[model samples]
Every structure is written in structure tokens, then in C-alpha cells.
Target chain A: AIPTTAAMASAKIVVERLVERQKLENEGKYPETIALVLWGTDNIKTYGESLGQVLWMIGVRPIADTFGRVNRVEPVSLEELGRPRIDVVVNCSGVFRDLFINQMNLLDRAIKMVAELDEPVEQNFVRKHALEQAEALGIDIREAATRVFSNASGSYSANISLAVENSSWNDEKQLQDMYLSRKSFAFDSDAGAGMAEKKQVFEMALSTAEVTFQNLDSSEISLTDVSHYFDSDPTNLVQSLRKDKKKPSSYIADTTTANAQVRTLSETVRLDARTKLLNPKWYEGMMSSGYEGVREIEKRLSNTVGWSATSGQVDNWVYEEANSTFIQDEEMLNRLMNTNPNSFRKMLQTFLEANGRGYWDTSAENIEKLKELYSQV
Target chain B: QAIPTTAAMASAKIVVERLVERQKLENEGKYPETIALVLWGTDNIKTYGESLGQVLWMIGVRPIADTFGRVNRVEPVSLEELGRPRIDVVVNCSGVFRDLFINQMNLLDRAIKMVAELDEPVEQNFVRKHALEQAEALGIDIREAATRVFSNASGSYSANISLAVENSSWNDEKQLQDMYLSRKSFAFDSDAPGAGMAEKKQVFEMALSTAEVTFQNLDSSEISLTDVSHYFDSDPTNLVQSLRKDKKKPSSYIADTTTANAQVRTLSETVRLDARTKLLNPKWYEGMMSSGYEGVREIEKRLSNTVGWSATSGQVDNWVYEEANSTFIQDEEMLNRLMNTNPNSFRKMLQTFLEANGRGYWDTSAENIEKLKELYSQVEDKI
Candidate 1:
């Protein structure tokens, strides 16, 4: 018998071979492509043989999908790419495949539109417009974002929490923390402006930091400004260095001779000689990168329009208050629920039995009891 | 808002921090020093929990059988070290749990013997002395080995093949290749001899490989012998440089000083040193670690009493035969099974189904027809 170790080694070799084979095949004489549509009863024996025959005829070997139909497309896709001439399209879609295919095509068109539009244009046209529509129905964006991202898993549990907590749990700390982390992760160029979508998402994120700062205790505000306001001051620079040695220095600096020397030295330390020469003036290039633009916009919005306008947290705070803590409790309950299948099933059975009769009030109590029983067991 | 990449990075950092915390806790006090007792479940949760609690208090942690228990024990066996300290006496009775524990104790004793003697002593004793213990049973070898090695997974399509196929599939060449690979793998003297069990597992493996080779009109015996003979010659000499030519001294010269001086001093051009050394060497370290021992044993065993021990064309082989002719039948069937689920879930379902029902069974037309109907629909429809 082949040993486990040997089998693992053999599998690795096979994978490597498959990769090499594909690469070699791609490089060789590309044959005319043919697409065959396979519609058959799931008599695996006959179906597999027919599929193999079609592939072999087309000079491609189909990888057997051990579970699903997703694997059958590779041979045909490769055929299309390698030999586009006389390409034949095969329709192997099962009974409901056409409906899914239609839905898929619709989504494809939507994705293409999203991909093509400029970020600012897309935000104005798609996200903002969508949010306005949602807001009419009492769907608060900031509240949803806060409720979702405040806990461990911010999706389903957050909704559950919103239903159960009745608007009592509010923590603005999540917003401030997210803002601080985002500042550390800032990119210098326009190329990076749109990448913040990777965070809690753009439309949903709202401007919590701006509002949080406005509502901060006087002491907290003072502490925050002390570290943030000065540019390249010796005391501030030294403190920043002590706090995070890995933190890259921002281009902002005082307009003084000493500041010039500090800038020169820090530039020498941070940027390579090539980069220093390529973008000789730090602050000018920084402005072109849009950091200055964003900062100016933030300042204008925060001072003139008030914190609610700056942060965009005004309409949705109630939902945020209700949805945070209950979400965490739900997650803890889920972990307990899934630890053992038998226990989970038994508890589920009890829950079903209690809820089967239309007493919704008693069902909740019974469900909670079931959860407790599962946890204790 | 923090960037999604930055958020994910932050989350990863949290996970790493949690892992570090766990590591620190484990280092501080939770060393792997627990003893497990596989107990068959019987009675109330409190009694079971109490028993587990007591075991943990005394033995740190243990595997036990109880419906209420999930900690410190695995079912069927407790693979704790044999002949270790803190073990006084063990009792075995009629109950299933007691019997299981007793079997574990027996295995513990056997493992001790095997570790010391460099072989499965109990199995070897039984095979050598009691050859006719159950010889009347046809297909008894496959049955016994399957039952013994993988009882929990018995009656599987690949059960017989499991004794041969490393994973789920087998090829004609893998059997012969394993013998040589095992030698190369465990060649280092520091490794234990049992590290090359694949070489000695020929009796079990030959069953499958031979069956496969038979389909190709090649006998497994000839392949095995060819493999052995090749090794015998290759292992003895510096085969890397063996292909070079050399000359010898001329004969018919008288033994005199003047005659010896007049004789030609011929030199062979082929004599030289190369950096490469043959990996397999029987006489390595004054025969301290011989590669030939297993080969010799295999030869003796195959030639003597174990010649008929071959694997049945188990589930995977049957699948290969039925599915090889078709292009995408298996793939399509698999697709039907996997439709709406994720790629991972699809694979898991396939594995579970294969484990339950041996590869494609052609005889059951009723079930086959049902399968065809099932595969006709989309994943959404099925779910």
C-alpha cells in the first residue's frame, strides 16, 4: 500500500504536472475550438464517457468534477482561448441552468457598469442615490454600519441584535478606532482614494470620526489635538517616534529654516535617493496626491456644516444604539449552539415544538431556555 | 472608514494575538500530559460528567464514552503511551466500554512489543503459527485486513482497496514504485526500520496493484521480482559510473625483476573519483543499515505462503473502469451532487457519498435511474 506520506508527495507531483501540462498545451499548436452542449440523464457512466469523448475529440481532457458541474467549463474555455477559429459553442446547461445563466448575464452587465464608471461619478450616481432611496424607507446608513461593524461578525447577528436589544447599546468607540486605523493606512496618491472601500464599505462607513471628535469629552479633545495639531515639532516628533517607531512621517511641516533641515533629514531617512529626486518637493507632491485636498475638504465640512453633516451619523444613531450588544450575545450563543451536533439538534427540536403553536411570546422564552440547556450540557 | 484591506489586516493581527495568548497559556501549565479513557456511554449526564471530572483531576484529561462528555477522550481507543508510569492495574469485563478498554490495553501491550522488537509481534505470531485459523473462509484475507485496519469504515467501496490504495485511487505502477520510494525515503540510519512499512506492506498492496496490472496483461509477481532484482544489482555498486570501460593486466609473464621492468605498465582510463554516491547501499556502514533485508523478506514471503494475497478490484478500480470510457459522466454526476453548495462543501459531499456507497455500482439499475433523475436538476432546485 502507498503510505500516507508517499501519497501526499504523489499528489503534489500530480498538481505540479497538471500546471506544467496546461502551460505546455497553451504554448503548442492551438486547434480549432468546438463547443458541445451536453444534455443527458445523470447516468454518470454514460454521461462521463460522452463528456470525455467530446473533450478527447477536441484535444482537451476534462477534469472530472467529483461533486458539481463547475469543472466541465475548463476544456471549452481553453478551447475558445487557444483556438478561436471555427469555435463551436456547447450548451451543457441543466434544466434550471438557463434561469441562472440569465440572472448571471444581468449581473455581468451591472458589474461592467460599476467597473467602468469613475469612482466619484459612481459614488454620486450609484451609492448616494441608492442611499437617498433607502433613507426614505427609514433605512439609516450610519446606524446599519455602526451596528454591523461594532461586533465580531457584523452581518446577520447585527440584524438579530437590532431586533432583540430595542435600541439600548451604543458605542461610538468603534467609529473612532476605525478612523485612527484608517489614518495609519492612508495612501499618498489618488490611486489610493478609492481603496478605503475595503474597510466597512464607503456609503455605509459614514463620517463617524468627525462627529465623535465633536462629541468627545473636553479632556479627550484636548489630548487628541495636542498630538494632532503640530507639524514636525521636536516634542511631538519625539513622542510620535517613541510611540510607534514604524510609523512613517507625514509631509506636513512648519514653514521655517529649521523645518527645512528637519524635512531634508527626514526625507533622506524615509525616501530613497531616486524617489527624493523624482518627487523633489515633498509637500507639493503630497498636495498633488490629494491628501491636502481631502484635509481641506474635511476642515471646511467640519467647521461650516457642523459635526452631524461632517460625520453623517445624524439620522441612524437610534438603530446603532439598539443593534450592537445583542449581536455579540448572539455570536456567543451561536458558538455554543454548534459545538455539538446532537445537542444543537435536540435544542432545535425543543425550540420547534415550543414555537409550533402560535405563542410567539412563550417561544422566545422557550428558545432562551433551550440555549441555556445547550450551554449547560 | 478604515480600508477593507486594513480592516482585514487588523483582524488577522487580532487572530495572531489570540493564538499567541493560547500558546502562552499552554506553555505556562497546559502541557500535553493528559491520560484518556475511552468510556462507552451509560447513565445520566451528572454521573458521566463526574466520571470525566474525576479522570481529569487524576489523569489531567482522558477520552471517555458518555453522551454528555466531549472532553479528554476519543471513542474506541485511548492511544496513550504503553507501559508508562501512573498506570497500576486495568480491569476488563463484559460491557462494551470495558471490552474496548481491555482491547486498548492489549494494543498497548502489543505496541510495546512491536516498538521493542521492530515488528508487529502479535500479528506476526498469529500469522506464522496459526495459518489455518480461519482459512476456510473465502476472501478471508481481504475481509480480515479490512476489518482489522479500518473497522469504523468497514463495508466501504474502497475498504479492500484501502489495504492497498494509499488514498482512494490506485494505479498499476504505484505498487512497484512504493517499494523503491520507501527505501530512498527511510535511507537515513537514524530513522526507524518501521518507517519503511510501505515496502513490507507489499502483501496488502500487491492485491490491488496486481489486480490493476492483470487488467493490463502484466503479472504483479514479475513486476515485483524485476523491481527487486534491479535493486539488488543497483544497490551493490556505484551504478552511476558503472557504464564506463576499463582494461586489465596482461598474462604469461615470468616472475623476474628484468622481465617485470620490461612488461607494459598499462593504466585504465576509467578509474577516477566522482562526487555522487549511490543512495541505496546494502553494505553501508559495514552492513549496519541494509536495504536488502526487507527485499529478502518480501521475496521469501511471496515465494512461500503469501503468494495468493492480492487485493480485490475494489470500489475505485470499478469506478475507473466504468468512468474511464465516458468523457464527462462522473463529472456531470458530481456537478449535480454539488450544485448550490460551495466548492468545499461539494468536495465534502462527494467524499462522504463515496465513503458510504462504493464507486459506481452498475448492477443496481433502480438506484442508478434515481441518480440520473437527481442529476437532471440545478443545485437550487435540489436544495
Candidate 2:
């Protein structure tokens, strides 16, 4: 597939960022001591001498050059290469076979030199040989160059602070400080407020028990069974709920308050149901029930809250509200659901019972009692 | 009769002794069980392998042939996989596979241990060089557990002789002949009974004729005792006159044996001088000779026996000997012609002839002498 406009825009942003950084270095605004590491077996001897000379001609100075099968890079050498201070490491290790990352974040700014760079001066033997070697190895230099830029941009956009943090050469203590500070604000309020609001409404609906059939004659019946029965003729339930609007308002407050509550609650529940459907386990479970269980839950929730939005709107809201923390926790809950699904179902059922008992109590006594019961081993 | 001795003969003796031990092992029914001779390469198998195998066979060792290419395998066979055979000794004549097979078998440790246990301390430099090169290639430290198996060396004598033989195979006959015969004579007059004038005159005429033919066939001809021994007898005062007369006389005469015995005793002094001058380092010779004439006697006896055995066994197809013989005769003729042109050249040629005679006598034997005469007579009849 061709790249989307957004992808093209992001790619352009990445390229621009690299060029700007190069510009800064050239201007001495942020001078970088670059080490063009020519690493590999025999290839180093075959190509290193010429490659190193070519890189030198192209304005790279590598202090303390060593060759052959280098298994480890000692900290002492890192300190020695520390003199002019290696800032940007330009890794030319083709295919990165034995490249080990000991110094974390040091390779973040590393740009692997590929064919897309400006060719060395025509008369230069070193560059000519390296070019022949690259040809022999069948490296699509432009693609590699594009990939390096794309990765840099993606990493930058994902966490711009982390990208900037990697630029400084610091001790272990500084890395620890950077890691803590960067991760602390990862689940900031703006990122998670929507999901929390949806959760709050879902909890409230369980409290009122309006989405269930506990108020009906057969209180012993599961919410699933009640949903299935109503789902056989969904419009009838919708019409009945619309006609007895005052009866629905009796549980809450006046029409304005009830409608407002209903609208917000309807969106929240719709988003919740759609998000759960996105979970593969939930999708497979609903599939096994032959869509009856799914439609039953949807129809009953629609009747209670009156949903008018399309499936697309529900998907968009769910996607927007899905924070990393929420997704991670949801995946963990799905794993638990698989191992002991019956116990999980029982736990949800008990939560609903406790919530319902606390719903209309203004004294807070029922909620406290429910909390104690829920907390018991 | 007493035997002749030289440093070259002594060196040859040491090599032959090893061969004799190989033979002894085979004769005792402990041959293949005690000795494992690993040979490699198609070229080596064709040449040395065939040669060594025949020698082993004659000595009673029936060698079994096995084929393998070392580099193709991911792992070489281990000691346990090598099976339960009474192979306390290994002779690795595989020039290229030395490092690979030895390392694979973890025989280096055993080799080093053997070296330590042996009466004579073996040189570790050669083994160290082999181990270090292999270790570098394997990306392993010599001190590491991975390299612990390769802590030793192979049979040093076998390794050295293999190198020497391989080198000799490549060297031209003329080069070896010059190397052996070009040295100054270490001869001194022995007061042994001289040959009659008639025999002296006959020897001179034969020497001149041989020189003429050798010079004519210089490129194709080989040096033999028959070609040059007369040049030594050309001078009446020379001790080789009596020596040559005693050796050439008919075996039926009882006095001939006594004469030959006296001639052999006279040549021993010449052998000592030649051994000191041409064969090895003087200090080394002194050490060997200081142990008494046993070392010299052993060498002469071994060479005499080897020549007799080779002639009788029809192993006279020895390529190295034939090449050296041809080159020596050609060079001797060249020297003879140069000497006849000038009187001073004659003196120099006479000195060269004596040394060449000393080298020729010790290196060749009665059987070899008889063989060469027959060979040359056939060539003359063809001409």
C-alpha cells in the first residue's frame, strides 16, 4: 500500500529534523564528535582501510581506531574516545550483525551510512572500493537511508523528551533521573480522562440496575437472558421506554437531568461495549453465543439510554479514550478472564449487586457496607 | 669389515632407527594396536604414503587406509569416538591436517604430557606456534577450556622428517649434490699398502674415459662412485687407492677380505673428518663423537645395511638417490675438465675428487657400486 498523507507528512518531518540537526552541528551550535564505526569480520580489513580514509575525506575523525572481531567495547575506550567527546555515533556496521548495545540511548542518534549519501570525490579510491563493496553486498542504500530517518522520526514523535534526553553523554545516575521523570507524566489527566468518565458511567448504570431486569418479576434470570428476550424485538422496547419516559425519570430526577444523564451514559456504555468487542476474547465469546447475547446487550442498553449514534462514532470515541495504561490493564484482565472466566463473571456479578445496594442510599451506610464486603478475603 | 661414518650417515641412522622401531612394533603383533599413522592429501598419499607403507609392510606392519577431509566436518571425531585401540603412539604425517586433526582429537595435551615425561626435553616452541595459530583462527584463548584439548604436540621426529622429505622432494638433485660434494676434502694419507702401477694406470684411463663421457652427457648423467672413485686413485699417494683396490678386488681371494678390512679401518679417520666438516655443526658432532665412536659406527652400519636391503628388495627405485647420483657425476666431470686445463686446477680438482670420493664411499655401498657399474655398462653397450 502507498503511504497515507499523514505517513508522508511524518516522513518529511523526520527528514527535516535530521537535516536541521546536521545544520546545527555544521554551524557549531551543537558540535558533535562523530565516530564512523566500521565493524565486521574480514570485511573490516577488506573495506575498513578504504572506508575509513573516505570517511576522513568526508570530514569524520575517529580517534583510536581498532579493527577485527571486537566482541566488547571497554568503558576505558569509551572514555578515551571521550577526549573530543563522541556525541553522534555514525554506525557503518553493515547489517549490524555483531553490534551490541551496551551504552543505552547512545545509538538513538546513530545514522547508518548507506548509498543515498553524496558520493565521495570521483578520484578517491577509498570511496570507489566501498561503493563496489556495497554493490556486491546488494544493499539498497536508499531504502536503508529512508528506514534510518523514519525510525528516528517515529522515535522522536513517540517520546520527544526521551529522544532529546539521549543526546547528552551522562553517567548512570543521570539516565535513571531521565527515565523516572519521563515516565511519570506518561498517563497525564488529558490522556486518560475520557476512559475514566466512561468507566464512571458504566459503574453508575450497574448501581441503578436499570440496564438489568432485577425490577422485573423474574429477578432470578441473568441479565444476559433478559437482554436476549428483549432483543427478539428491540424496537418494541425502545418504543415502550420512550412512551414511559416519566417512569424512567422517576429513578433519577427531572426530564432535563435524566435526558442529560441518559445521553452521556448512552455514549459511555456504547463506547464500553464497542471497546470490549475490540478485545479478541470478548469478540470470540460473543460469536459463540450466536450474536444473540451481543444484540441483547446492545438492544437493552440502547433502550435504557437511547443511543442514536452510528457504529463509527462509537469506534472513534473508544479509540480516542483508549490510553496505554487502560489497554495494558485490559489485556491483563483478558488473560485472567481466560484462566478462570467463571470466577471473573461471578466477581462482576457481585460488583453489580454491591453497587445496586448502595445506589439510592444517601446515608453512605450501604456503600460502606458494600465496600467492606467487597474487600473481605 | 669396519664401517664408514659421517654426520649425514649419523642423521640417516637416527631416522632409520625410528623406522626400525616401527618395524619392531609390527613384528611383535603390537603394530596397528600401538601405532596410528595418519596420512593426508592425495599427493602425500601417492608419494610418502606409498613409500612409508611399503617400509612398514617390510617391517611387518600392515597399514590400513582411511580417507577423510578435515574442513568439511562441523566437529572432528573425539578420543572416545576414536575407539578402544591400543594406540599409545600416533605418527601424524598429514602436513595440512596437523592443526585440524590434532586439535579435534585433543591430542595436544597428551603430546605435551609425553614431552614432559620423556627423558629428553622436547622443544615447546614448534608446538606452541601450531597451537597459537589454531587458537587464533578458532577465536579462542589458549588458556581457555575450549583450547584445553590442544595442550600438546605430535611426534616431533615424524613431523621433522616429513618436513625434510617434503623439502628434499622440491629441491633439485644438482643442488643437493653440490651441497654434499662441494665441501673441501677432510682426507689425510693412510700408510696402507698401495695398488700396483698397472692397476693405477688402468684406473687413470677409466677415470679419464668416465670424465669424457660424463662431460658429454653432463645434462643427463648422474654422479656415482664408479664415475669419480678413479679420480681419487689418479694420485698414487692417495689412501683411497688402497681403499678402492681393496673394495674392487674379487671376493674369492682370502687376502681381499683382510685388505678390505684394513681399507675400512683407514676410511674411519676420513669419515670422522668429513662428519666434522660437512655433516653437522662441529659442536654437535663433538658431542656425538665424544660418546665414543659408537655413534659413528652405528651410522655407518645402518647406511651399509640400508643400501644392501634396498638393492635386494628392489626398492632401488629411490628417486632422491638417482637424482643426486646423476647430478654429482655431471658436476665431477665439469670439475675434472676445468682441472685438466690448468695444473693448479688439477690440485683443486684433486681436493674436490677426494671429498667427493669420501661422500660417495659412505653414501654408497658395494651393492650400489655393483649396480651403478652394471647400469653404466648397459648405457655404454647401447651407445
Candidate 3:
């Protein structure tokens, strides 16, 4: 029931645009479920705008009491929504589960309340799809209405980022398996304090999902800024959905600006690499900051490698441009070397890392340059 | 394993009695209701598939195994030869059974799933009749409605329902029942029924809703139902407790595995048997008292456990409490032994009996309860 934030309004509109985009992409067909990534870091930053998008999808709104604490969710009327309520599969991170349990309980109560509505199924996708899976699986609609999944009890981190960062996985399937095993636990009023191990429904949602979406709340943190952006569940779920030859769109809800915008994961990575990493305007500012600045450059480069490992959407040109901008330029290369030689060596090492990890195709000259630069460092 | 043999006499018959007994006998004994059974790993180890035999006999099927006695497929017996309708059954296995009998679980599922579509009259094929009716009513397919076997989520065992009950953390039977369902309600079938399908909560509840009674076989006399809290806690108390929530005051029954006869007892009767054997028996209490403080604590814990059944099921009789009060409280010699040995335990034991009275599970004379109050204070002073 938080009444503030243009981000919340922007998130709602972003979801609206997504539905419109998905519908136009299909031939008048509605995507039954969208798998969403919910993290507390973004939620708190955006005042639960991702949460706002979820409730809006289901045609409900959170109700707050007292000063700021929200304890209830109210359904937005069908006439106002003017479209079918969207059913979503929520993949909350362990942090969200820890910090926003009241929000979690609200969502649980919201779905259950909506599932019991006596409206026509065509208008209420929440009830419609819940009933669909319930009938197919021989469960009550309320049980099937359970849509939130997270790490099992008392756990944090999906281990997706860890595996991706460590280069510990061989195939996309391993990432999907890790995601399934780690975040397969479900929360509902029925489960109460217990996180029921619920892989079947989790996989069912993943397989049927038509879109994977998450909000980008930070201007500084793009999809490649940290391993988490790549390690997020949507990255794994996109991998899962596409394994069956199902082409599911992955979108980032960019709320880092006044008018929240949505972009493809490919587009998001391209924007981050262009604006932050490859752009001279951004890099020159960092190079002037001495040692710390050059290290930041390496850190961003490493995260870009992680994006390649996990999402497989990083354009090789991002790496090519990275090599040319940092190592291929004599002035930039000397500045990097003198300012911080170790950071310079690691940045070149990441460029080579990107090559060996199959994210970049490199020339022998480039390989020789990195080897010589590393030996010098 | 589907090694065929002569019927284990009372085993199958007791199953039929409990199934038919809890059901409404309106349709010429063509019971469309399903009965639930709790099969433990210990039961299979000790009773040699007696309960498993009971399940097959109810549904009019026999397990046909390969040369290795592994169930290849199950074949149904004729109704004419069987002389009864093929009753429906829901199996809630223990974590151990799910671990030990992986193939046995699949075999049982196939047997029940197969019988849900047999070509026979409604009365003759109650398995098929009930599943089809439930499928239509619930807007689900036959396989969905016919999905029976359930257990703890794979790699998990209990919600600690017994601990909640044993610790008096619960306010009513509903809390305990919810705890039981909260953990035990995952349906086991393919893609991981060997490990319960984690999200099939309502299906488990639906399966449970059709159940009018829950029965577990007592394969050993050495351990009674109340002897271990989980034995009684899971079976009649929590299982039927969920049933009662759906407006059915369900019956609970136990199968006697000792004699080669189909002897059945209602839960009330079995609870009394538990009381008669140990809780009320002078030898049991005196024998327990031989060990001093621990024995006194054991006696007190036993009484608390007796009250546990009352809290969950109300199966403990009024006479049982009255007798316990008299034999343990009114009788001076026994009271002195309890007080002298463990005064705090004796105080709590008296407090437990008063709690039973306060909870309305037991109705005792005011004089006897008054004596308990007076004796507790005197004991408190001595301590």
C-alpha cells in the first residue's frame, strides 16, 4: 500500500508495455505466464516497484495502513484493468525472501484471494491458469496458485552466479539444474513457515513461461556490473524454456530513469557495454582516477565475462571493443600500465579469459599482446 | 515384490472391514469412499507386506512379479471370485518406506491407476467409480483424481507433528493436522513421486478429503500406538483430524497382526488396549518406578502422552483418567513412591491429569480432582 514512487508507476507501465509487446509479437495470443526475477535490492530501491508490477499483472494493489507498513492487498477492478489479468511465475532471490516476507505473505494471500474469485476465467488469468494447472495436476486451484519460489529454508544466493563466476559449469543445462535444485522451494499460507520443495510446479512454470523479466533499478549497476544480473533466475529460466525449443523473450525493466523503459537482455548488455565500458567518455573518467579507477575497469570487464558465461547474450564486439580501447591503444595502454600494472594485467587477462571461455574470438597478435603484457606485469 | 502366496489370513479382511465400516452403507455395501492407510518401513520389514497385501486385496488385484520377484505388473482378480467391490485406497507411506521401496511404490501406483478404469458395474468397480466421479466433480482427469500415494517431500521426513503435539505447542487438533498436511501432503508419482511432487498440496488434501478413516497395521505387540508419539500422532490423530475438518467425524481403526485372524479394533478400543497394557497396568508403572528419577519422569511423560491422544483425538476414555487419578494419586503408597522419587515429575503428572479434566477429555468426580489439587500443594511443600 505504499503510495509513493514514480518508479512504481513506471514499473506498472513497463509491465503494460511488455504485455503489449508480447501480444504484438504473437498473433493476438496471450502469454500465459511470465517468469519474473524479484530481488530486494531492486525492490527497496524502487519502493517495491517490481512488486507493484507483479500485483498489477494479477490486477491487484497492495493496501497500506498506519504510516508505511503494508498489510493488505486490494484487487483492482476488471473494468479499470481493461485486459485479462496476467499470471506470473515469481522467482524471488533469497534476499527478498529474508527481508520482504510480509510482502511475500501479501503476494500469497493476493493470489489465493484472486484464485477464489467467481469471475470468468477469460478475464482472470490468475484463476484461469491456476485452474488449468490444478485440473491437469489434480490439485486445488489455490495450491496451483502458489507462484513464489526461492532458495530452500535459511539459505541465500541461487548459486547461479557462483557457478557462472567460477566457470564451474559445462553446459546451460547445468545452470538450469542448479537453479531448479536451489530455488525450487515454495512459500504459501499452507506451507506457513516451511519452504516446501516444489520442483514440479517450478519446472512447469519455467517450461510454460513466455517471458522472463526483471527491473534494473540502479543507473550505476547494469546487467553486467555484478555476477548477480547474469546469475539471476531469468537467465537460467530463459535457458530452461529455450531448451525445449521454446523461444521466450528476456527483458530488463530499466527503472534507473524517470520513465522506466524495457529492453531485451541483448539490448541491455549492449547498452551497458557501450555506455559504461566501451565508451571513451566513461573510460577516460575512470583512467584519471588513478589505481582504483583502473581496477574498476577490470572488475567491470570480469563481470562482462560473467554475463557471457551465464546469459550468452554479450556481443563479442563488446569484448573486441574492450580489447581495442584498453590494450590496443598505446596511450590508454601506457596509462593503465603506469597507473596500476596489476590492474592492467588483469584487464588483459580478462580479455584472454573471454577468449578461452568461448565468449570472444581473438587474433594471434591480440593473444601475444596479452601474454607479453601479462609477463611484463 | 510381487511374490504370490496364500493370503495372510486377518490382514486383508481387516482392511475391508475398516474401509467398509467408515463408509455409508447405503448402496448395498458398494462403498464409493476411499480409506487411507499409513504404511511404515518397519511394517514392511516385520509384517512381510501384510499391509501391502491388504491394499491389493481391497482393489481386487494381485502383484505379478518377474523371476526376481520384482512386480512386473499387477493383475486384477474377478469380482465374483473376490465376492466384494474393488474398494479405493490412498496410501500415505513413511519416509523410510519411500526410501526402501522405490519400485514397490511404482508398482502400487500402477495397480491403483490401472483399476480406476476397469470395465465393470459401478458397484463392482468402486475404484473406477469413485475416481471417475471425483474427476468429474473436481474437473480433473481420471489419472489426476486416481492419484493416490503420498508421502513426506523427498529428502524430508516429518513436519515434526509429534514434537508439536508432544511439546504442547499446539492449541487444538487443527494445528497438529495442519502440521501433518504441511509436510506429508506431497503426491508421489512420476518425475519424482519416489520423491513427493512438492507442489501437489491440494491433490493431497483432495485425496485426504475422500478418506473417511485412516488405519495403520500393528505388526508388533512390543510397541503400541501411543508408545511412540508418531505412531498414534500421524495415523488416527492427524490423519482423521484433517478428515474431521471437512465435516466428517471420521473413525480410526487398527489391524491386529498377532493372530492369524482378521481381528479389527476401532481407535477407541486400541487406545484402551494401550491403557490396559501399560499406562494403567500396575506392573508397568511399578516396573518403571524401579529406576528412580528417570522412571518417574518416564511415567509422567507417558501420562502426558496419554493426554496427547486426548488433545489430538479424544480417544482416551473418561474411566482411564479416573482410574489413573485413583491408582496414581488417591492411592497413598503409589503417590508416596512417586513423590519420594521425583516430586517435580509427580507434580507435573498430577498437573497433566488436571489438564485433561480441564480440557474436557476427562470428566472426574470433584472430590478426586480436589484431592489431586490438595495433594499437589502438599507435595509442593515437601519439595
- Compare the candidates by TM-score and give the number of the best one: 3
In order, what is each prediction's RMSD in angstroms? 31.0, 39.9, 24.8
For candidate 2, state the interface root-mean-square deviation in angstroms to 1 decimal: 56.2
Give me the iRMSD of candidate 3, please. 31.3
Task: Report the C-alpha displacement of residue B32, candidate 3, in angstroms.
Answer: 6.7
Which CAPRI level is candidate 3?
incorrect
* Cα lDDT of model 3 by residue, B1-383, tens digit: 64223354246656565556554342223354567778777777666577777887878887776787566578888888777778777788888888887666777777888888788886577667767766776788787777777788778775576677556666766777777778877676643444455556666676666565567787437677666776655664455545532243346677766666645777777877778888889888889999899999988888887877776665665667767887888788888899999999998898888777776666444466778899888988988
| Predicted candidate 1 versus true structure: per-residue lDDT over B13-65, tens digit per residue | 33322322332342322211111111222211212222222222221122343
* Candidate 3 overall lDDT versus native: 0.73
| Candidate 1 residue runs with Cα over 4 Å from true position | A1-331, A334-377, B1-383
- Using TM-score as the measure, name the better of candidate 2 and candidate 3: 3
Which candidate should be chosen as best, given lDDT against the real structure? 3
Instruction: List the DockQ of the predictions in order.
Output: 0.02, 0.00, 0.00
Arrange candidates, best lDDT first.
3, 2, 1
**B274-316, model 2: which lDDT tens digit per residue?**
3333222345433434544354433222233223212211122
